[PDB]
Amino acid sequence: ASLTEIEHLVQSVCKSYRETCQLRLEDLLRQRSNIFSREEVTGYQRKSMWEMWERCAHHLTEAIQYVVEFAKRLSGFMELCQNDQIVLLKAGAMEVVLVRMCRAYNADNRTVFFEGKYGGMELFRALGCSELISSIFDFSHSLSALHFSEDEIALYTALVLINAHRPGLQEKRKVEQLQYNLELAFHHHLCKTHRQSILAKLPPKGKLRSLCSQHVERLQIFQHLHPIVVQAAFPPLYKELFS
């Protein structure tokens, strides 16, 4: 890859992201003043564990579908063999949502946009996994601190997805080359915008891996308790990724 190639990979990644970002920044920023009441929060806290897990699984699945659409649009992605496409999405889709969450997260009052309003952690108390929720809020709080632009998110999430280290890849060298070009793309843009100061501030890694393992660990506990909720009422795509 020449420099002209990576300069134009930048605009192209950002385009792909803009088209698949799901929720417009403009709407999320505007709806920040729209916060669930104590009564609504209580109503959520009164739901059964399983109704809450189901609700959450549906919303996450919906988010993952945009991520699959993002991936299908990413320069280079559809060029990978089917096996590696599936390995990369099985491992990185939740990760990408976890990064995309920072847009939908308001660090001023620690609220996330959920079913049409902003709410705090406590909104999800029925789930039976407050350690994980807590850590997911923290992660978004840290990312929010960086004042990530839309272009940064696009570039960053394209790298979260294209990870040549994921186990199970048949064509590790092709994804290595792709990862390299996206890394260059990401760092070139940061350089051009005077924003390399953040590279040292980015979240460590595993870190995203930890969150995603906790998610699966927690699912696994819930499935042991409510195995028929999962079989009967969790979306197929979600069971494929995390079950």
Binding site: Q65, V68, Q82, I86, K90, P236, L237, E240, L241
Partner: peptide, 10 residues
Amino acid sequence: KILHRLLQDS
């Protein structure tokens, strides 16, 4: 199953 079908779609 489901992802394979998403990737193959028009």
